[PDB]
From a paper:
ThiC, the enzyme discussed here, catalyses the complex rearrangement of aminoimidazole ribonucleotide (AIR) to 4-amino-5-hydroxymethyl-2-methylpyrimidine phosphate (HMP-P) in the thiamin biosynthetic pathways of bacteria and plants 17 and is an example of a non-canonical radical SAM enzyme. The CX2CX4C motif of ThiC varies from the canonical radical SAM motif and is located near the C terminus of the sequence. The homodimeric structure of Caulobacter crescentus ThiC (CcThiC) showed a (β/α)8-barrel fold and suggested that the cluster-binding domain, which was disordered, resides near the C terminus and inserts into the active site of an adjacent protomer through domain swapping. The cluster-binding domain inserts into the active site of an adjacent catalytic domain through domain swapping as previously predicted.
We prepared two different crystal forms of AtThiC, each containing the substrate analogue imidazole ribonucleotide (IRN) and the SAM analogue S-adenosylhomocysteine (SAH), which is also a competitive inhibitor of ThiC21. The mode of SAH binding was unexpected. In the canonical radical SAM enzymes, the SAM amino and carboxylate groups anchor to the differentiated iron in the [4Fe-4S] cluster; however, in ThiC the fourth iron binds to a chloride ion, and the amino and carboxylate groups of SAH anchor to an additional transition metal site. The conformation of SAH is also stabilized by van der Waals interactions and through a salt bridge between the carboxylate and absolutely conserved Arg386. SAH forms two hydrogen bonds with Glu489 through its 2′- and 3′-hydroxyl groups. The adenine base is sandwiched between Leu259 and Met572, the N7 atom forms hydrogen bonds with the guanidinium of Arg343 and the amino group forms a hydrogen bond with the backbone carbonyl of Gly230. In addition to the amino and carboxylate groups of SAH, the metal is coordinated to two absolutely conserved histidine residues (His426 and His490 in AtThiC and His417 and His481 in CcThiC) and two water molecules. Zinc when added to AtThiC at a 1:1 molar ratio during crystallization largely displaces iron at the additional metal site. IRN does not make any direct interactions with SAH.
Numbering used by the authors:
A (entry chain A): 77 to 595
B (entry chain B): 84 to 595
Amino acid sequence: PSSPDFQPIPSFEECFPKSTKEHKEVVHEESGHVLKVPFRRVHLSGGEPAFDNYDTSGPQNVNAHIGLAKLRKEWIDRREKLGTPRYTQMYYAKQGIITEEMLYCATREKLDPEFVRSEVARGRAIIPSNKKHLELEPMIVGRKFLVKVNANIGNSAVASSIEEEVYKVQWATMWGADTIMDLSTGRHIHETREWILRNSAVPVGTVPIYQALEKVDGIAENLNWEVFRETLIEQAEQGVDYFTIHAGVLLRYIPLTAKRLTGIVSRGGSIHAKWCLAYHKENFAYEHWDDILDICNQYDVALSIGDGLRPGSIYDANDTAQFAELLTQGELTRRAWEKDVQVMNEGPGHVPMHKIPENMQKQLEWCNEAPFYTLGPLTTDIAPGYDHITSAIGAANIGALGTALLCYVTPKEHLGLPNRDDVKAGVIAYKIAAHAADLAKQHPHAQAWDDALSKARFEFRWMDQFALSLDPMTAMSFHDETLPADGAKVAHFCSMCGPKFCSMKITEDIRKYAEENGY
Amino acid sequence: PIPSFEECFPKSTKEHKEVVHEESGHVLKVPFRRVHLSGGEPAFDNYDTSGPQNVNAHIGLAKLRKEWIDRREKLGTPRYTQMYYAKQGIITEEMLYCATREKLDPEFVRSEVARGRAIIPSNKKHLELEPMIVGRKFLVKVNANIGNSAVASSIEEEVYKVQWATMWGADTIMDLSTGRHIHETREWILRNSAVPVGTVPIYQALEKVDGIAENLNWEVFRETLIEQAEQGVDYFTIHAGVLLRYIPLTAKRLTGIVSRGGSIHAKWCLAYHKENFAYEHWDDILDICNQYDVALSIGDGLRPGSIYDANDTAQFAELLTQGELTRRAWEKDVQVMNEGPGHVPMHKIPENMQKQLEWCNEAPFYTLGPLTTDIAPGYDHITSAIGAANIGALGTALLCYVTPKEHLGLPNRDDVKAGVIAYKIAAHAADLAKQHPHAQAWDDALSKARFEFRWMDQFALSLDPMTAMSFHDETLPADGAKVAHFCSMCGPKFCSMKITEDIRKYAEENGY
Ligand SMILES: Nc1ncnc2c1ncn2[C@@H]1O[C@H](CSCC[C@H](N)C(=O)O)[C@@H](O)[C@H]1O
Ligand SMILES: Nc1ncnc2c1ncn2[C@@H]1O[C@H](CSCC[C@H](N)C(=O)O)[C@@H](O)[C@H]1O
Ligand SMILES: O=P(O)(O)OC[C@H]1O[C@@H](n2ccnc2)[C@H](O)[C@@H]1O
Ligand SMILES: O=P(O)(O)OC[C@H]1O[C@@H](n2ccnc2)[C@H](O)[C@@H]1O
Ligand code: SF4
Ligand code: SF4
Ligand SMILES: [Cl-]
Ligand SMILES: [Cl-]
Ligand SMILES: [Zn+2]
Ligand SMILES: [Zn+2]
């Protein structure tokens, strides 16, 4: 058991000048529980109304040893007292019950609680919310809601540490990660995840087969259902909100990967496949799917059905292996719904832009509109070091088509373990992709953000412009590289055009002239 | 002086494909870049915009087009544009050079140029130019904007930035200087640029009258055109579509007129209640352009500067007029492209392409992004890469880059590189989406290197080799790690491609 030397992340005020953390109090009628739903408020100058935005940053300045407040405790205890055969949001929704989690999400999304219940009940949205993750501020994932972003963190045998991964969780959520996954493959996996869960206000996912492999000393041939099952229960008891499980990597699909350029690039999927060939046996997660469901519906662990046969190169995009798995993902989805287990489906991968629409169309149909969860896609293989940009293109496009959760890709993809700077870069790039998708879907009020920043830009309220942005101190420091003076924060120009050539200032002149003399 | 070609692209060599222009016997040396790989893999040949290396800026590049131009002059001709020659059935040195660079038929190039669907920006005074073509049927091209302002930068910094931009893949540049020494700065750039150089003549015209738009007139504008055309400027952005009657259509806009040239014209028009003097003198402008072969980039002075303003009346009014000006320009054999948006949300991008294709008779489209959202100043190379890739996939021929300093200040050399890398990504992603021939060969080569753990090959094949390598080396710096079947992301036990090796080894022996 390590004694990590934790470093506090920069403060909320440092990251978001002129912002405050706020909460909307709403009362859950059936229980009388009071919910405090987070949002962030940007205070503007010149008498503009304050701008309210989503807030994933969670409780601030909490000592890691103490952990976040357990805000969901009285919800869980009351539902436990009332007695129930299943504990998932889907079960409650199908009973016609609007839970605290549903009301919370509804408020957070500014939609009707009954609409939220309906979407969860039909399986088109999920609320990943293990009853052991009491610290969680509930959120919803689904095509009819804001496009969400996941940040992957975790150590490897080669790099990082508990204190660095706890920093990265707090940092990822500060910049807007809606979920995280702890993908640790090194030492102290159980400990690392514990620290993260007790200090994360967003859902935390894992890939259980990683730790299962770590337990059998990295020898895949020594995996079996017993060790996998033990791992599922361990992680469920900690509070993991969703599991990526590669139960679609069937024995008969593995030969389909033989002629691929980059083979099987899924970590989990390659592990399952190796085990399958070694024994010529069927995927033990597939074989024990029912047993897995019986675990998940007692804790409410959502299942993220993995795509072990996702393409790892443009060359392999939309090939037979990938779509063979997708078909099976749909089967597993329907089976999970029978047991009231919440499901999302994992998708590609490396996919050129003209092949992206086929991916969405097939998933929507074959998986009956379960939420889709994509890694990018990366639209080209040529730019390692910049794969947050290559994949932002694909993420935005497939987001516009209905993808509900975008798994980020950092500048270090294909190169090494991301550090804290890489985590921020990835989150910012994917917040851009997710918001651009919200706009393309004409999601209600999404453009208000753009309009507020653009108004500040035209009116030369520079500090307002910075404060309204995704990353205020970056915008400001960039501006200030050439015009550092306080006075330049009210200039009707910047260094790009200078005072004589600033088009918005010239537009001010034009409108002044027209106001007096007409057009 | 900029980092060397070898420092930027390890294992790469600059090469040239030699071809002979039959009608003249002139020998053309068409550049390309070859990445030398390990393990017996064939070398990968890529496009190369970097131009002649290690030439001192005070000396300037060799004047490779001199004999081309001198001969065409001797032979006598009423017009000097690639469109005029193409329409005469002539395949010029520039067209053959382009065909060779694009790996396409010289006759196809001539056909595209003659119908106005592609342009070869190639002022006969820019003798240093290595010809390139802009058009939907060709590789998607990228433009880098550079230049000083009254507030920042200098002649040396801007000359650096032009060499730097082209090093990383800029296919054209524009010198948008609005500060001191505009004429001299542009001279240095033109003499040292192997790629087409564009300008916006109205900027220097305004500088000539000390920043007072009301003191502009046709005379000072025409003097500027002649001055810039004599230096060798390959294309002019001219906002002749900002008509007097369109200005009131911008009154309700959230961010008004964001075009620099556009706002200047609109101010002048309102001041005098007179029609745009570039519009009024369009015929005169064409009479200048077809003697130098200065291509015209018809500006979109009324582009949207916010998501709110996207695809509004003002924008489309100007687009209709751009089509008119395009057809008129073609009548005088002036090569034309049309400038486009702007700030446009993704669901509105398809309409932009559809309407430009129809209303402007398929002239090459030249977009600024577009930016798909306003929320992330500091990252507008990414917000706009999304838009650029998408509108490129629909047929946009030239993508004007957007740097991380957009809306914030004058980009520096780092920002220029970031801008070019982001846009080379967008351009290539568009090439793949268009299924442009051999486009995926690049991706396939790097991905093969990735799967076989030829790490140095992977780095060498990429858009920015040293960034890739330095990123990898942050956690695994030893030379030995360059042949490891893992990296620090997964480690030895969890690397999926190494596990795939194991899977295939097992199948090779025992079957599937
Ligand atoms: N510890 C960690 N921290 C952050 N991301 C991780 C991680 N472990 C795995 N990942 C993510 O999961 C991927 C698996 S390793 C290589 C996957 C491959 N590039 C592909 O296309 O799927 C990584 O590329 C990264 O996206
Ligand atoms: N000197 C220079 N160096 C690099 N880019 C320049 C430049 N001068 C102008 N530009 C480009 O031209 C633009 C004009 S100023 C503002 C334009 C506005 N943001 C819009 O959406 O169109 C700049 O934002 C930048 O993209
Ligand atoms: O084990 P594999 O590589 O499949 O999973 C790596 C990561 O990628 C995520 N992902 C998302 C879509 N496809 C894969 C997955 O949830 C996990 O975060
Ligand atoms: O004067 P304005 O702002 O129109 O032009 C600014 C820059 O933007 C470029 N551009 C490209 C498409 N629309 C505008 C134009 O060629 C020049 O590089
Ligand atoms: S000077 Fe140019 S870039 Fe700066 S605020 Fe004005 S219009 Fe925008
Ligand atoms: S360890 Fe993971 S990221 Fe690194 S080479 Fe192997 S598969 Fe790629
Ligand atoms: Cl990889
Ligand atoms: Cl601006
Ligand atoms: Zn990959
Ligand atoms: Zn702009």
